[PDB]
Amino acid sequence: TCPFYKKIPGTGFTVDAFQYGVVEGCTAYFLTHFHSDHYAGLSKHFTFPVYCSEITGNLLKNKLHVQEQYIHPLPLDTECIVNGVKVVLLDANHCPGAVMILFYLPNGTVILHTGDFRADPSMERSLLADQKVHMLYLDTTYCSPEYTFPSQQEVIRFAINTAFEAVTLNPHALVVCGTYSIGKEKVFLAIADVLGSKVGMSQEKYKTLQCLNIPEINSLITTDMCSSLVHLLPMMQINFKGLQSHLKKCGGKYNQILAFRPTGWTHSNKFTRIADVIPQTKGNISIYGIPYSEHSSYLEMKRFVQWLKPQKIIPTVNVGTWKSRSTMEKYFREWKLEAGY
Numbered sequence: 001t002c003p004f005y006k007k008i009p010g011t012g013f014t015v016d017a018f019q020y021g022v023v024e025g026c027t028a029y030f031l032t033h034f035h036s037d038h039y040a041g042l043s044k045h046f047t048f049p050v051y052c053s054e055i056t057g058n059l060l061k062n063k064l065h066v067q068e069q070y071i072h073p074l075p076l077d078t079e080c081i082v083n084g085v086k087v088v089l090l091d092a093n094h095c096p097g098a099v100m101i102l103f104y105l106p107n108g109t110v111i112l113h114t115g116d117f118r119a120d121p122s123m124e125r126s127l128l129a130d131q132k133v134h135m136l137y138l139d140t141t142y143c144s145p146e147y148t149f150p151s152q153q154e155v156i157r158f159a160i161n162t163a164f165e166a167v168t169l170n171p172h173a174l175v176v177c178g179t180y181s182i183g184k185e186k187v188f189l190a191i192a193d194v195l196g197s198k199v200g201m202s203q204e205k206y207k208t209l210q211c212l213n214i215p216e217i218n219s220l221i222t223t224d225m226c227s228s229l230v231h232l233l234p235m236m237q238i239n240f241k242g243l244q245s246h247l248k249k250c251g252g253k254y255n256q257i258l259a260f261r262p263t264g265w266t267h268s269n270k271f272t273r274i275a276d277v278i279p280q281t282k283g284n285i286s287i288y289g290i291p292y293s294e295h296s297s298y299l300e301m302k303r304f305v306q307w308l309k310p311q312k313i314i315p316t317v318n319v320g321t322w323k324s325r326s327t328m329e330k331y332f333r334e335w336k337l338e339a340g341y
């Protein structure tokens, strides 16, 4: 059964609610982004209207085989009427295709659902500038001050410099990058660009990337692993065993691996600056865990919410324990007293 924080009152709408069977009274199902925790349930057998971005719609069609007649892509930054209600989709600064949804309810209430997001000051000059929001359904993944991590630009600088240095010292090193979902593609695209190589991967991953409207993509990726000195592998193979196993396959072309494991936040952020990060090493294999986040840091979230000044906040992450829910409400009240709304 569909929880309350996935329903939009006064409409026939749900958001990210595909794993509960038929939702009583739902005439349109919104999907914020193509991550499995949110799409859980969709397939070729789905027969209700799905509203989403163009990129999400390409993924639904090609990866889940949802029939074309049930896919409803909307452009961003544009007022659209769906089942007699005005909506807008806004870029969430999460993974490719990810959106926030503004709903202009028939009774005059305005609701913003963030989906998954990485808050940014650029959002203060979207269509949000204009107006009041009565209810914010907020991605609270990192809603506590201990959650600190660098900018994406700093993390990419570190990865580019690390890989360019290694391969310049040893032209026979291979670079490997772990993946498990869409998102974080800049990690492997930036490294391949500094090395003058395409990125090699499986046919399944290549298909996924071909759905993302990335300009000049045919110039950047390939399924010919042997022609490539940046390889992608599933995230679970990014360990000393899995990497040794991979180096055997390459046929004595390479004599070293340098690997990257992009993560979310980890507790070594509480001590170590991005510059100071060191790898785990066994023999001719080195592995770097790098904190490339696509969710808001505490400070980013606080800034966005103190700017928006919503009337009420409904968290959509960390809602399962009394202690979590209690801690989040304390922070929402400080923010409100500090800023005066």
Ligand code: NI
Pocket (backbone or CB within 6 Å): 033, 035, 094, 116
């Ligand atoms: Ni997500």
